[PDB]
Amino acid sequence: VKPNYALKFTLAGHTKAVSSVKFSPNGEWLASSSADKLIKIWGAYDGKFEKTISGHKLGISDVAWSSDSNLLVSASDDKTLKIWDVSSGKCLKTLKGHSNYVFCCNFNPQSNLIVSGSFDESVRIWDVKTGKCLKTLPAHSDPVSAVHFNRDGSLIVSSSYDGLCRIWDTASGQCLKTLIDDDNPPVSFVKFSPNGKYILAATLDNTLKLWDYSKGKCLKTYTGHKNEKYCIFANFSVTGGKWIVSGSEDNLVYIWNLQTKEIVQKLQGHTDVVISTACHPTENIIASAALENDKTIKLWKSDC
């Protein structure tokens, strides 16, 4: 099998580089964050502008949806996170605690917690209801590039430019495991597989790796793309064929066969680094977003 993603929409709304695009769990919306201090909500199927959400004092590096698709959390250079009522665009909570740029964020599957990573080299765990920081994990020795809950919510995976990938116990905050590469390249992105068994880790040596963190063995390796400078999102595509999907610094979207590790498709259209890619929860739809020279969001549809 081979995917046939084709360009359906190009969304131009941000005046600065886009940083992150995420689909709502209910499949209705796409949220985009940008260096222009703004969040925008679009229709996932038609690209129709729904709303602009503002309030952050500086640029935004990441956004994430709650499981009920009602809340958004955003991570900003203004050292804070913000919890937003999507339907009103009102800031429900301002998460204060980090001492530098907040770079990455995610809700847990229950959506009672938020995990954040920061340029202050720490990973924080916040209570959604009260907005209070529950835990501060002294996670890394460099800016935290990604943070992600497993499907059970009990584990938090984190990555950093320091070369480490860590598995943390959510309940205790203890570093349950530490993945180590002897060559130690900066880890620019990490994410649990949709089964919690593996983690997909990007390193700034033009490499993606599917790791079994338990045994500490690299199961898969995906190459061909360019990634040496930016923290580019990667994804497990599961609605059709089992793909690995990632942006690239050569302006392309790369799609690999997960098992064979072969590049099965390259999506062309962006004219700057494709910093972000996301996969629709139910449909074979990919969203992509690019940096300053581009500033657009693109939606791609495939049959398989």
Partner: peptide
């Protein structure tokens, strides 16, 4: 920050 090179 994500849109800039560290």
């Amino acid at each position: 920050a994500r849109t800039e090179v560290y």
